[PDB]
Design a protein around this ligand. Structure first.
Ligand code: NA
Ligand code: NA
Ligand code: NA
Ligand code: NA
Ligand code: NA
Ligand code: NA
Ligand code: NA
Ligand code: NA
Ligand code: NA
Ligand code: NA
Ligand code: NA
Ligand code: NA
Ligand code: NA
Ligand code: NA
Ligand code: NA
Ligand SMILES: [Zn+2]
Length: 866
């Protein structure tokens, strides 16, 4: 399988302007008729090269003439000797029931549905399956009326009819030209939640949520969030919906989270279905996020699309930015920012230090489905946020306006977006563009000097990015470096120099530079990289007292949290080294006291307190180290939890009790209180056994919502409490018929600290609620084990790697996209000790030799074994 390269982009030899599709739908054999209106733009002698995968070609006509000048080749139909303008008619067959990869047209339970992004439409017919070919679609669907009473495609219904033998048909038209990755089709029997939204200018939009029969009780929150999304996009970005109907279909079998197909979004059920006894607060807020995200794509992705797939972050970074801004505006901005930073530093930084490292705009791709990444998405969004930091809101919105004015109705590039922002704002982004081309995480080193004779404070700031396996050359970036300086009372020191104010966003553009601030009348405590102003590692020699001071005084809630993270990092590192020497946890009394103070501070937002009291995950901990010791990390996380639980026992119980809420509401103040209460419960679970068991068991049994029930259950597992097995059985017996709810339980089993976790996980391959055919179940049991229990995955006997190999041997053939997600923990081998590397390498070599190795896995394995 051959790499493709961004620098090889060339405009297509042929365009398609209009396509009329007919589907004679059947699970075993679907017949597709595609009539495309084509226009030659290249040389007269160039053939039309269509993409196609696993299609049974029935016929090829050009202007209704059966065509002889064609040939099928690997992945392609190559059609020669064409006129400059013509009608192409292709008839082909496909088999949805055989489609275990869930790409193209496939079966989800009894429904038929599609996934076309990135390159799935070529599994449906022979086409120009590239996103700079935009065509007006019309779609006729013919099927059995009893099995498929709802026949859905993009746009509006233009025709309908009934046929002999129990078949019927519906034809759809979408006026907006689209790339084929935005085509969708759905056929099935659903319950439908129907509502309306009226846009600011008065356009009435029919809203329709399709869910499996019996799931209407779980639909209203996703509908609410849809309307919230539409209102917010009007208020914040001035964007309205552009069609007459907005359809969302929730399907149980889905690889990609959710999908923005124009007017017909298809969602994994996990990001639609919620009710208070099935879904947690985090599920609610994830529904909200993802509903918003797909909606936001209507403009940032659909009305302006991608010229080629190397521009994926043009839509994904921008739309993740939008979903964050939506969440943050409606909910707690500090909690959203904190959690997005946790993702960046724990999960994305790890990718940027891996063999799969790439810039947000990749240069080389073998399988484009491998590049729906933390980098393209989350780092993409940090890059858009840097633009927002550099420009400010008003100028950033001016750039959005210019981007749409220039590019509405077209496929554009990352560079086009940057140019719009630059031209609308007058801010120079020439240097800033390097963020699109350079991979790896920059390291920003800061040293300071206070000169009491001159009352000047000097920051000396250096940057470097280490080489990555994909790029040997690195250069300095344009790093927006936000600061704030605090005097000894906790008040902000005005930034100025030579009599003029200095912006608090420093432009760190060189390998090394100094910034001098005048009229600094007290030695400052600095808050550095405020609100994570650039996606960088920060190296500053903090004293503990500077950090506890920020925890008390910093103006932005994020900075209080970040200071606590910096304070904890020192002691996480200390204690991992101690663990490797067989020594127990050591923690200064003054560090425990800082967290006691957070517990007892009445003035702190409980949302913020909860996050300060949520320890970094094992993934976030790993990124503090060059060589990861996953057992030490897991054991130190536990020991730290236990030490704090002992030292803060009375305070934790008092705050736990103070935040009791008898009514359950999905409201942000209530969510905040519950997150704080359940943060205290995590530590309390690690108190004296008798107290902890009673407290946890009682919360599980008295809970009136799944947030509280799951928090108790998770604490029974994490602390190995006496009540654990009984509560886990109770949950299984109550919820085994509900896969989304059982996913939470598979995750707890997979992440259990119990010594026999792998045996349990293997046994759960036969569980009544588990199936290898469902990506959510795979993710929740197998994925959670490999990715979220690195201590067990990395068991010294190598048993974790052997288990993953067996699962991957199945999934390579069944569903390569899911396989490729799951291999990620194995490709991190160079971060581990030599003996682990040797076992991981042996595992990778075994997979390398699989018969019919997927391109998806090939790309990752070859990078890892290099
Ligand atoms: Na047409
Ligand atoms: Na072919
Ligand atoms: Na076109
Ligand atoms: Na899109
Ligand atoms: Na807010
Ligand atoms: Na491919
Ligand atoms: Na593929
Ligand atoms: Na410029
Ligand atoms: Na200093
Ligand atoms: Na200092
Ligand atoms: Na430091
Ligand atoms: Na990590
Ligand atoms: Na301990
Ligand atoms: Na099963
Ligand atoms: Na991991
Ligand atoms: Zn997206």
């Amino acid at each position: 399988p051959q790499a493709k390269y961004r620098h090889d982009y060339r405009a297509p030899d042929y365009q398609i302007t209009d396509i009329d599709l007919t589907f004679d739908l059947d699970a075993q054999k679907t017949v597709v008729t595609a009539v495309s209106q084509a226009v030659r733009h290249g040389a007269s002698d160039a053939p039309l090269r269509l993409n196609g995968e696993d299609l049974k070609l029935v016929s090829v006509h050009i202007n209704d003439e059966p065509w002889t000048a064609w040939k099928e080749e690997e992945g392609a139909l190559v059609i020669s000797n064409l006129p400059e303008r013509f009608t192409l008619k292709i008839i082909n067959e496909i088999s949805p029931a055989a489609n275990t990869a869930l790409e193209g047209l496939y079966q989800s339970g009894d429904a038929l549905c599609t996934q076309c992004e990135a390159e799935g439409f070529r599994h449906i017919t022979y086409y120009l399956d590239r996103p700079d070919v935009l065509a007006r679609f019309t779609t006729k669907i013919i099927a059995d009326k009893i099995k498929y009473p709802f026949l859905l495609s993009n746009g509006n219904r233009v025709a309908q009819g009934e046929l002999e033998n129990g078949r019927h048909w519906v034809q759809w038209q979408d006026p907006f030209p689209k790339p084929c990755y935005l085509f969708a089709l759905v056929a099935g029997d659903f319950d439908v939640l129907r509502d309306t939204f009226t846009t600011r200018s008065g356009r009435e939009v029919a809203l329709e949520l399709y869910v499996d029969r019996g799931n209407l009780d779980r639909a209203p929150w996703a509908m609410t969030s849809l309307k919230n999304s539409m209102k917010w996009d009007e208020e914040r970005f001035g964007l309205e919906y552009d069609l007459d109907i907005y359809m969302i279909v929730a399907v149980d079998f889905f690889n990609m989270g959710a999908m923005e197909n124009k007017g017909l979004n298809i969602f994994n059920s996990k990001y639609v279905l919620a009710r208070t006894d099935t879904a947690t607060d985090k599920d609610y807020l994830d529904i909200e996020r993802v509903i918003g995200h797909e909606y936001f794509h209507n403009w940032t992705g659909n009305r302006v699309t991608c010229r080629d797939w190397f521009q994926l972050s043009l839509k994904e970074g921008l739309t993740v930015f939008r979903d964050q801004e939506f969440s943050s505006d409606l909910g707690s901005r500090a909690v959203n920012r904190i959690n997005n930073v946790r993702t960046m530093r724990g999960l994305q930084f790890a990718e940027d230090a891996s063999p799969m490292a790439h810039p947000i705009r990749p240069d080389m791709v073998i399988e484009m489905n491998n590049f729906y990444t933390l980098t393209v998405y989350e780092k993409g969004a940090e890059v858009i946020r840097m633009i927002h930091t550099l420009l400010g809101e008003e100028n950033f919105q001016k750039g959005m306006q210019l981007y749409f004015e220039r590019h509405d109705g077209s496929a554009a590039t990352c560079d086009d977006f940057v140019q719009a922002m630059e031209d609308a704002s007058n801010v120079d982004l020439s240097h800033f563009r390097r963020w699109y081309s350079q991979s790896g995480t920059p390291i920003v080193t800061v040293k300071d000097d206070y000169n009491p004779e001159t009352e000047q404070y000097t920051l000396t700031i250096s940057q470097r990015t280490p080489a990555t396996p994909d790029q040997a050359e690195k250069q300095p970036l344009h790093i927006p470096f936000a600061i704030e300086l605090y005097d000894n009372e906790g008040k902000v020191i005005p930034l100025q120099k030579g009599g003029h104010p200095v912006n608090s966003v420093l432009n760190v553009t060189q390998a090394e530079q100094t910034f001098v601030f005048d009229n600094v009348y007290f030695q400052p405590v600095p808050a550095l990289l405020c609100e994570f102003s650039a996606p960088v590692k920060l190296e500053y020699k903090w004293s503990d007292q500077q950090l506890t001071f920020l925890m008390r005084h910093a103006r932005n809630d994020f900075s209080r949290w970040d200071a606590a993270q910096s304070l904890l990092a020192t002691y996480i590192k200390l204690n991992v080294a101690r663990h490797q020497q067989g020594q127990p946890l050591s923690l200064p009394v003054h560090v425990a006291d800082a967290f006691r103070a957070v517990l007892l501070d009445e003035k702190i937002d409980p949302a913020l307190a909860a996050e300060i009291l949520t320890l970094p995950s094992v993934n976030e901990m790993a990124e503090l180290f060059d060589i990861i010791d996953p057992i030490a990390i897991a054991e130190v996380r536990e020991a730290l939890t236990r030490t704090l639980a002992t030292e803060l026992a009375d305070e934790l119980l008092a705050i736990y009790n103070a935040n009791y809420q008898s009514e359950y509401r999905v409201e942000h103040e209530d969510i905040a209180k519950r997150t704080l209460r359940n943060a205290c419960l995590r530590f309390l679970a690690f108190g004296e056994t008798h107290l902890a068991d009673v407290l946890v068991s009682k919360q599980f049994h008295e809970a009136n919502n799944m947030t509280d029930a799951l928090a108790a259950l998770s604490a029974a597992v994490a602390a190995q409490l006496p009540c654990r097995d009984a509560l886990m059985q109770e949950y299984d017996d109550k919820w085994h018929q509900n896969g989304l709810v059982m996913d939470k339980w598979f995750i707890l089993q997979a992440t259990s600290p119990a010594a026999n976790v792998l045996e349990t996980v293997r046994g759960l391959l036969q569980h009544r609620s588990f199936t290898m055919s469902n990506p959510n179940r795979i993710r929740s049991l197998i994925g959670a084990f490999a990715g979220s229990n690195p201590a067990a995955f990395h068991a010294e006997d190598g048993s974790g790697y052997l288990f993953l190999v067996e699962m991957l041997t199945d999934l390579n053939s069944r569903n390569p996209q899911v396989a490729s997600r799951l291999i990620e923990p194995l490709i991190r081998l160079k971060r581990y000790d030599a003996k682990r590397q040797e076992k991981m390498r042996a595992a990778l070599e075994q997979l390398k030799g699989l018969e019919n190795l997927s391109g998806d896995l090939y790309e990752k394995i070859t990078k890892a074994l290099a």
